[PDB]
Amino acid sequence: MSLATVGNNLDSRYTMASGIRRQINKVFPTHWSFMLGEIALYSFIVLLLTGVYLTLFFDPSITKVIYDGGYLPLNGVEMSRAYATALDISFEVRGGLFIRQMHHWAALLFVVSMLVHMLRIFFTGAFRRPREANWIIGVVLIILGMAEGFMGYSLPDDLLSGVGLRIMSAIIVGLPIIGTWMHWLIFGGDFPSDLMLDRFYIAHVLIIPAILLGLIAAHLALVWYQKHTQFPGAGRTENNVIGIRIMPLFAVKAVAFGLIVFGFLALLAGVTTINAIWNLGPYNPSQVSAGSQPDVYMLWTDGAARVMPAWELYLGNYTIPAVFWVAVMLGILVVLLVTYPFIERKFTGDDAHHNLLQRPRDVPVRTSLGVMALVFYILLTVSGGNDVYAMQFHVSLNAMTWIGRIGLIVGPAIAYFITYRLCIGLQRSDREVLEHGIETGIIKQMPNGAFIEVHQPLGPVDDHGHPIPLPYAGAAVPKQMNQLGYAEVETRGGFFGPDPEDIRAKAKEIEHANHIEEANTLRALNEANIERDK
């Protein structure tokens, strides 16, 4: 094919060869947990495309109609146009239920992938300088994704979702001094109203997606510009990046992992029901169900409302309802999440330019704060679905409320203690290996009857035979012998027979040479880095 002509025309018109050489040569570090952001990206793209598909069949109106659609067990029932067209998406469009469920599963995947990505960022310390901006905008992103899913599942106007909207409305009126006016502004009146579903619909399909995409764009541009962090290791410095290039390796790997994500969501979308609005019926202010609960990424808010005591102030002609402190709690924990880098810099005094990461064992205060916050959020999430838990595990409901209350103090504290001590223990295990060598597992008996375990040193030795203790380097230390390659197979062939011995000998020689030279280049780069530090 005559690609020469295409490239020549493009280059003569844009002067693009150097700028594109710079991007195909860019390097990315290839640890596995640097793919957790990617999942959030791919599920977001799925959400976009499946979302536009749903908008071709959906009417977001609160006007009422008598149903005459496919699903016969609701024909003749008065319902909003929103609920009616969600039923038509589910039953009268070919493959519509498939795309609906794919959309909802993509939403769940988007939010949880943002969560575990943020936890990687937290536990490894990738937030600290020069990278705090990505932290602030990422906290904004997780909050807006949560709001987006809420508004999204509020659209089909079923009973459960409308109870959610009722609860939102009740919380907004309760605010002093301005809750009533805020409610009348947001909802255009009393709840339900004409323009509530139209406003949630245009918030869901246009406004919040636009902000989400713009901030994802800024986020990925900053990640591309400030090159990625990396763990310590052989050759790795603050001033470099070791990994693979965009072209060919990393781009292909990104496309393939994206295909995997798309296919997994497609599969979920077929083999498991989600939401199932046709069992719930249309929304009615006078009805309710026992398994209420919002979506999973909102259960923490629900749990916060369940564990709160009924603390109200009467002032006396004015009232502070008991849920106001739940809003205060949510505000506190949002502010503390978004401002954590500055808290850590206040109380550590660290303010250097960091491009290397920290193994979570080596920063135990942060890991313990992390696990305690994980436990506070877990108990809020289980407090949300605590009545389903009670029903399904033979626990008293009230017992679960008090479990939630007390747990939100004693769980985080026990978690802090246990996490901290386990962190120091893992540090000590690594220091054992760097002090005395790998415990091979072999026990010999000496002539005097002494059972001694055979150690493999990772460094020099004194004339007694004892290793010279190496300094810790922030990297992973091998703990067993098979990590050094002493279990590696040395036959070669298919499952049902070997290769010819000529090829096997040649291949093993070649593989040995490969390993020797890879070790040599990392050792030379290590020495060069020492020399650069003089």
């Binding site: 050489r21 390097v27 005459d68 003749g76 009268e92 070919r94 493959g95 469920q101 020069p130 009722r166 409305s169 009126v173 309760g174 009533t180 009348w184 502004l185 255009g188 009393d190 709840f191 090159k227 050759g235 470099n240 070791i242 390796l249 292909v252 496309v255 992992f257 994206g258 295909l259 995997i260 798309f262 296919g263 497609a266 599969l267 077929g270 083999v271 202010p285 006078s286 009805q287 309710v288 409302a305 369940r306 009924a310 006396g316 004015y318 502070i320 008991a322 849920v323 330019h353 009545d387 009230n398 070669r492 290769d499 090829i503 291949a507 070649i510 490969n514 030279e517 890879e518 780069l525």
Partner: protein, 402 residues
């Protein structure tokens, strides 16, 4: 340094590649081929692994398109013919599509993991502060622009310009006051069966307009599909959504949800008209935000030990009590009447109201007792609302007393 065309010609293609990467401060520390042996059996062994998933990518894609076109997708109810075929349409769609896309992804991952070479590449960072000449010179240019302008000298033009800037901003955003609405200005027109559209009222306020308001039970009726030579028509002309109910109806320890049913919208009893279209208005009443009322009948043993609230004595009629079904926490239905304990439980955040202690919350995040409706019976023995609530219904808000 630069290169003449003759020197770039003298190079080999790998040498040009090395120069290309080093121009970006990248260096390939290590790089080695996957199959150096000439006709390796392992390379053919790897090719068959990749082609396996590509074969199934093709199989799954074709199976998806077959399933999507020719599998009977249309709705079937329980007991219909071909029910099973319908229940599996979406499942088959997803398992075939997952087969296709996951197999393509796995083919590509395997191809990377055992055909493309392996490499260590090392890129030098350029971050931190800039190179000081650029910092000094950009500061010089920006300072030059500000002092060049001469606007710092002119405090009056600066003050007025800022004032006009902020005032133009206000002029831009002021039409957002088309959303602001006084929550205390009533709804348009007269009062409705949903109230005046403020947080004080409900449909039960209509008693104050001298309207007779029955307690009405929901019949849950649906529209009926009439059919004739001019088509098929779902209609509601002789159908009552709400019907009056009588004190004999509920056994002891029963609970009924009742709504305000003004006497103008009734269509039941011997005075029933088979063409009196009232379904629309009764539906408007069932969907009032704070119209639902929980009407309980206590047992005599329970009513012997029921505690009354100040001013709400004689709201009950015999053993019949009536509370607002709207939770006093943040507004869910308080639907769960534990018949034996006589405790009304809210399934949202697990508040518990004592039906024998004027509905006072005894557990959960609720703090106020459920409002109580005064009820009685009329000259024909239908239950009616003898008055309006004496409290604001629903959750709490800043402007509420107690």
């Amino acid at each position: 340094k630069q290169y003449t065309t003759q020197e770039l010609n003298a190079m080999s293609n790998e040498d040009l590649a090395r120069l290309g990467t080093e121009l970006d401060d990248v260096t390939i520390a290590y790089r080695k081929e996957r199959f150096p042996i000439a006709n390796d059996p392992a390379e053919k062994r790897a090719a068959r692994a990749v082609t396996f998933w590509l074969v199934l990518g093709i199989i799954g894609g074709l199976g998806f398109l077959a399933t999507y076109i020719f599998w009977p997708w249309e709705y079937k109810a329980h007991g219909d013919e071909g029910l099973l075929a319908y229940t599996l349409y979406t499942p088959m769609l997803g398992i075939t599509s997952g087969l296709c896309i996951l197999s393509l992804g796995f083919a590509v991952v395997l191809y990377v993991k055992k055909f493309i070479p392996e490499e260590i590449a090392v890129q030098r960072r350029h971050d931190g502060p800039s190179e000081e000449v650029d910092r000094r010179t950009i500061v010089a240019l920006l300072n030059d622009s500000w002092q060049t302008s001469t606007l710092g000298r002119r405090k009056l033009i600066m003050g007025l310009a800022g004032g006009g800037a902020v005032l133009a901003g206000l002029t831009i955003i002021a039409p957002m006051g088309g959303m602001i609405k006084n929550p205390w200005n009533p709804k348009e027109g007269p009062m409705d069966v949903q109230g005046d559209g403020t947080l004080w009222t409900s449909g039960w306020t209509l008693v104050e307009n001298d309207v007779k308001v029955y307690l009405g039970r929901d019949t849950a009726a649906i529209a009926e599909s009439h059919t004739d030579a001019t088509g098929e028509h779902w209609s509601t002309t002789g159908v009552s959504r709400l019907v009056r109910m009588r004190p004999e109806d509920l056994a002891a320890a029963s609970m009924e949800t009742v709504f305000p049913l003004p006497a103008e919208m009734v269509n039941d009893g011997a005075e029933y008209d088979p063409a009196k279209d009232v379904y629309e208005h009764q539906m408007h009443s069932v969907h009032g935000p704070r119209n639902a009322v929980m009407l309980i009948r206590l047992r005599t043993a329970d009513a012997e030990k029921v505690i009354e609230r100040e001013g709400q004595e004689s709201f009950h009629y015999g053993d019949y009590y009536a509370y607002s079904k709207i939770c006093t926490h943040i507004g869910c239905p308080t639907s769960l009447y534990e018949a034996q304990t006589n405790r009304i439980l809210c399934p949202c955040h697990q508040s518990q109201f004592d039906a024998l202690h004027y509905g006072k919350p005894v557990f959960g995040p609720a703090a106020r007792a459920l409002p109580q409706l005064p009820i009685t019976v009329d000259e024909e023995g239908y239950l009616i609302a003898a008055g309006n609530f004496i409290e604001p219904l629903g959750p709490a808000f800043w402007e509420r007393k107690s």
